[PDB]
Design a protein around this nucleic acid. Sequence first.
RNA 1: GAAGAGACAUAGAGGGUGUAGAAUAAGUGGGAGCUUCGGCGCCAGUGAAAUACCACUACCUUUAUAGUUUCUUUACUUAUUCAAUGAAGCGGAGCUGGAAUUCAUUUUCCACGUUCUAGCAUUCAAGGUCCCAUUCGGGGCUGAUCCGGGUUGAAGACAU
RNA 2: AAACUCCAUGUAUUGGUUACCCAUCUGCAUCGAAAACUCUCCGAACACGGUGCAGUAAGGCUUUCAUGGAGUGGUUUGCUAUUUAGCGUACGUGUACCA
Lengths: 217, 127, 66
Amino acid sequence: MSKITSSQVREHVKELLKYSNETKKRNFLETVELQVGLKNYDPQRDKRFSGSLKLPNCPRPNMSICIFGDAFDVDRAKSCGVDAMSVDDLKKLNKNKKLIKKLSKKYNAFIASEVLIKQVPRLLGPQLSKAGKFPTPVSHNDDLYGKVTDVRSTIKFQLKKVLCLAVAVGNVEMEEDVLVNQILMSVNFFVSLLKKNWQNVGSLVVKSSMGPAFRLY
Amino acid sequence: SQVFGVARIYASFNDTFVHVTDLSGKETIARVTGGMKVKADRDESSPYAAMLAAQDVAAKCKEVGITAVHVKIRATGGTRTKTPGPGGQAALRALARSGLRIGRIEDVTPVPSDSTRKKGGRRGRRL
Amino acid sequence: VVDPFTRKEWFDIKAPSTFENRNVGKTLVNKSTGLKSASDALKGRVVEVCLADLQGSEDHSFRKIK
RNA sequence: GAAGAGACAUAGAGGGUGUAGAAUAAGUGGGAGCUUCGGCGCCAGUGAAAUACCACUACCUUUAUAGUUUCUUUACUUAUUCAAUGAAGCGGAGCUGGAAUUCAUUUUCCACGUUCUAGCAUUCAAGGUCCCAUUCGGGGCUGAUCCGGGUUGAAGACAU
RNA sequence: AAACUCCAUGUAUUGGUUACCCAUCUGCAUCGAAAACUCUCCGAACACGGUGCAGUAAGGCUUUCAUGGAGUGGUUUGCUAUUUAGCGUACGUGUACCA
């Protein structure tokens, strides 16, 4: 069951977006976030998952993604407009996990190859997967343009020890109807994945990234 | 200047009690007997057991706030010996050796008038 | 380990006006709380103290005052 | 009703150790931005973690609003229970007498016509004072303080 | 007589870092004898303590072929006011410990 009052959430979204756009304004590409909590949920004893939902458009069009793979997907990434690297260097670079964590922080999302599934868990395993941006390998025959656009419009659900899961949704510079569609589809998917449906979720607070404190529910 | 407790050494035969109380006597601080320091059952009243018992009392008298003691020496009293045991002198001496100041040492052996019948019979304990 | 001595209040004891210096000594009691309070456990205490302590003169080394 | 031990709501805290960076770091994704500082973070080193902004707050104690399904204890009386009597003097306040070393504060507390004697104790009670219309007598008040109409005692949300 | 514990080079997935190996919740075989009636035997007994197996992983679910090299021998749970120590000093399991 949808426990959301549609007219009230539409008015709340329109006033929040008016606040983020017209009352206050900055060139900072702000990112609206859904930080959904958990009530009467025990993360440790209950089975979890790492899942990937899709979005109608990019939550933030200035989000960097990196690729590792063969020279073919390297040149495809060059046509894409995203930086590409080799894999022999990473074999030496496995030693400094500090530098691996630094590069994982600098490149906040990674993608790999079906041949790189051989070498990834021994070299790029620990720090990158601790960062949790799980690389889904691309297909050389499939469209790297399409895969880049997919990663532009992906959402990663990583239910961890904390009971508050927070993921970005969109922006303010783009349109608003698709943003409302994004928030509504995200809460519907979260309600569907929750194993007690609306009982686990306790609140749904969206806040314009540079804004004040308020509680929706 | 000095925080005062009451030492209350019970020095009978067969044992020795070092029972430091508060100044009013109601609250107990470190009652350590001679049987708590040696396990031989014939030297519980011995001076060595009493000196160890007294210094363990002074070990807890410090780190609670007690820096000086009023000493009350006790034999068995009643219809019994009225003479302090061999361990009262060692326990009293060890309290002074441990840094706890002393004041108004007093003998508080319970002394009857003539009283109920002492045990032993008419011919007494004959061995 | 319990250590019941870290939970007492360390009061102070006075003397009546019919004496010399009236600081007799401290008293270790309990922290007064609810559920069988330890405030009235200080109403009936009896203290034996020498008169020379209460007067400062050794001429009353005997006559302990209750 | 009151007190204590609560818990759940309540609304606001802040803070939280190794390492080692630019802070004694348990947190999110951020790529640069509100501005009293060109200060903080940023492309920079080095850190299990990048740092303004918490935005949901893991985990909170501390409160003062204001709480409600409790657990114990302690009180109240009006349910219930017990007893008595021809339901006669209960409770509160007084007046008097005393003790109170009044401090111009009933501040306090006791007493309230009876104890040598197997007598007697009743006629709305005599007296005093007021009014009769006083027709031989009659009626008030006081005698015999006032007030509350809770008969009195026990017990009590236990017991039954 | 030699055996086995570990690191690296890495082949299928050995995978998902508070990183296989922190792992225990749980069941399934029992570590054999005090210098004991000297010893020994069978039997009443479910084991007289750690390893092995599985379902449960504060990594999402199997342990994968291999090779090279580092590597041992002792202190015994006790008694006694000789206590920074004086006597006494079973083996089979892991501890504590050393060089």
